[PDB]
């Protein structure tokens, strides 16, 4: 079976040679005449306290008003960013949650984690109570990230190197995506919903389409596990944060690594990655209790935003790009503008 | 004015709902912080189920001793890769590490796993209530003479029973030498990195022991005291 690895190496060398032939100039020397962002100071406008244990994930939704946050108590608390009012506090049968999602229309909320079960809840009830609308099983490993396509379909990345698309009323998987060697830890959907990427624990970000179960392309160039991923608002690029203290922006069309954001001063690993509305600002939440903002054109650290007593776990930016929500392990959600 | 009055009525209703939710969270505060959460780690043959038997994807059991509650987790539904979900168990107060003393092939990987747990960034401040399961099988194996410690640990020849060690009443010195060699092997890597903060709590237990819950309760009391002696400068 050595000869199969031999032509695998041959095609790898062909891919490397083709990538070398495709690229001649990097984005760094291309963008020199663009004026820099400038020093930006985002004060802590709101502080959304009340979670019993550490927070892992959050989501915003189409309206820039209602957060949802999952904590290790087993609580999904749905906040209100304008008035800091806890609209709902859904309890969980399993305290080990790891991710949460908020539907584009404010109807459904999702959670899951070490119980290997994706739970979907209705944010409407004629009886007036929040109930477990659906339980989704079929994943052997822990669920790392869930996202909503619409009110019907939900794509979930699990701990057994599988990303599965699920139909809510059917209750079973419709299309599985395999090919990763390590645990997938992040998931980001396209503005046109056609494509989505998954970054795994093998420095690999694989791009998939939600219709047929194929990997469009693979992106490599990191050194450790990928902890976060996020598309560009344009939909043709995406930035990945890893444990190697580097944020790497890749291009879908070029099938190549575009830009690196790192410094010799930084020592920890990136946990969360997000963009702004225009896409120039890359906000990355690190493990050194702070978050760093970067320009996506010149890799200059525009500012450092602090105020957390533990590692930053989740970062989110509203669909209109108004505010940035940060959630750390000290049970404190912070809104920044 | 009627529309403004209705808007204020809805705003006060939302504020009342928020206050009710906050009251429920404050009610759950004491109940959540009263309980102690423990995570079990070990091998497949380590027998990490005999620890609590009288009061008995994720295997959870609850036992209460002397008005102190204990959740006990045995996550084994995942794959063998541990570097990702082990960050979830950071708020636990202790880790019950169960090691089969009779087997020697898995003893080295148990040592490596314990070293990784001790030196982890997100498990740095977690104390380990380290157990030594299956003492009787170890005793029969070492009195049989078919298997030798020196085949897997060359430093057994240059080792003797510590004077601090208190042997069980009635046994040959060989079983004590072997079991305290394993205890010292775990404690050597337990007391090499962590400068205070977290400590190992070695114990010797068998399949017929009926008081392991008491050991866990006393050790968790000690861990709670040493944790309360951390934010305060007293130590």
């Amino acid at each position: 079976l050595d000869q199969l690895r031999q032509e695998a190496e041959q095609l790898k060398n062909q891919i490397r040679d083709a990538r070398k032939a495709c690229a001649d100039a990097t984005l760094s020397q291309i963008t020199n005449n663009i004026d820099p962002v400038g020093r930006i100071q985002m004060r802590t406008r709101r502080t959304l306290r009340g979670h019993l244990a550490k927070i892992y994930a959050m989501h915003w939704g189409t309206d820039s008003r209602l957060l949802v946050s999952a904590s290790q108590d087993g609580k999904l608390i749905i906040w209100d960013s304008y008035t800091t009012n806890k609209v709902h506090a859904i309890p969980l049968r399993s305290s080990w949650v790891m991710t949460c999602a908020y539907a584009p229309s404010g109807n459904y909320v999702a959670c899951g984690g070490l119980d290997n079960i994706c739970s979907i809840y209705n944010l409407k009830t004629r009886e007036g109570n929040v109930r477990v609308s659906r339980e989704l099983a079929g994943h052997t490993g822990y669920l790392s990230c869930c996202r909503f396509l619409d009110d019907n379909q939900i794509v979930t990345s699990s701990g057994d190197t599988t990303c599965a698309l699920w139909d809510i009323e059917t209750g079973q998987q419709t299309t599985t995506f395999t090919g990763h060697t390590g645990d997938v830890m992040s998931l980001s959907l396209a503005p046109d919903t056609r494509l989505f990427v998954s970054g795994a624990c093998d420095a690999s970000a694989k791009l998939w389409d939600v219709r047929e179960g194929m990997c469009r392309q693979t992106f490599t160039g990191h050194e450790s596990d990928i902890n976060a991923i996020c598309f560009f608002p344009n939909g043709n690029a995406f930035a990945t944060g890893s444990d190697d203290a580097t944020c790497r922006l890749f291009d879908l069309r070029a099938d190549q690594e575009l830009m690196t954001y790192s410094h010799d001063n930084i020592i920890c690993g990136i946990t969360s990655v997000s963009f702004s509305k225009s896409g120039r600002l890359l906000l990355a939440g690190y493990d050194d209790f702070n978050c760093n903002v970067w320009d996506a054109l010149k890799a200059d650290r525009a500012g450092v935003l602090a105020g957390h007593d533990n590692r930053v776990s989740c970062l989110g930016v509203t669909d209109d790009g108004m505010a940035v929500a940060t959630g750390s392990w000290d049970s404190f959600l912070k809104i920044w503008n | 004015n009627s529309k403004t009055e209705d808007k204020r009525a809805q705003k006060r209703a939302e504020k009342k709902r928020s206050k009710l939710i906050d009251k429920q969270l404050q009610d759950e505060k004491m109940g959540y912080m009263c309980t102690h959460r423990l995570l079990l780690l070990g091998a497949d043959n380590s027998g990490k189920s005999t620890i609590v038997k009288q009061m008995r994807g994720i295997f959870e059991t609850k036992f209460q001793v002397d008005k102190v509650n204990f959740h006990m987790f045995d996550v084994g539904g995942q794959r063998d890769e541990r570097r990702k979900w082990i960050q979830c168990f950071n708020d636990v107060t202790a880790i019950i590490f169960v090691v089969d003393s009779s087997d020697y092939n898995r003893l080295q990987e148990a040592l490596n796993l314990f070293k990784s747990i001790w030196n982890n960034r997100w498990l740095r401040t977690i104390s380990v209530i380290l157990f030594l399961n299956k003492q009787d099988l170890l005793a029969e194996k070492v009195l049989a003479g078919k298997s030798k410690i020196e085949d897997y640990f060359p430093e057994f020849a240059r080792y003797t029973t510590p004077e601090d060690a208190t042997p069980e009443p009635g046994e040959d010195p060989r079983v004590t030498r072997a079991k305290y060699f394993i205890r010292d092997e775990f404690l050597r890597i337990s007391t090499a990195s962590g400068d205070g903060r977290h400590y190992c709590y070695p114990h010797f237990t068998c399949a017929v022991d009926t008081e392991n819950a008491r050991r866990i309760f006393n050790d968790c009391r000690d861990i709670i005291q040493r944790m309360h002696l951390r934010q305060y400068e007293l130590l």
Partner: nanobody, 126 residues
Framework: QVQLQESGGGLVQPGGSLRLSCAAS????????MNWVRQAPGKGLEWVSD????????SYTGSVKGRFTISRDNAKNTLYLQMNSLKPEDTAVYYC?????????????????????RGQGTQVTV
């Protein structure tokens, strides 16, 4: 892209001396702890040796304590392991596994082939 190349080993009579070379491409080799892990026929994965970033702290499995030696070269980005006075149960497929973290002294490399940061290994037959 991360890659690890393993060279050396083969049909070696017992009692001989054998050197195994692991070359690292991709990452910065001068920053990562590195482990040597063997898989024997009919058994599972088991850890053999490790070496830190600067080589200050090393450790060996008791079955290979003393005879085995390990070294690394950060300028060449290549590490070496030498075995002397071999006993015939050492026949196995050997891998150099990278410790998947930037600045640590601990990680988790004994996994059932699902690990990523590990080369194809070399088969040593004795």
């Amino acid at each position: 892209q991360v890659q690890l190349q393993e060279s050396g080993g083969g049909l070696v009579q017992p009692g001989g001396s054998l050197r195994l070379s692991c070359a690292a491409s991709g990452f910065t080799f001068s920053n990562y702890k590195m482990n040597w892990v063997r898989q024997a026929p009919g058994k599972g994965l088991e850890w053999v040796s490790d070496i830190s970033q600067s080589g200050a702290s090393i450790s060996y499995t008791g079955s290979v304590k003393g005879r085995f030696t390990i070294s690394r070269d950060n300028a060449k980005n290549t590490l070496y392991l030498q075995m002397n006075s071999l006993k015939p149960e050492d026949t196995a497929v050997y891998y150099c596994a990278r410790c998947p973290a930037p600045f640590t002294r601990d990680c988790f490399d004994v996994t059932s082939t699902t690990y990523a940061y590990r080369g194809q290994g070399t088969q040593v037959t004795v």
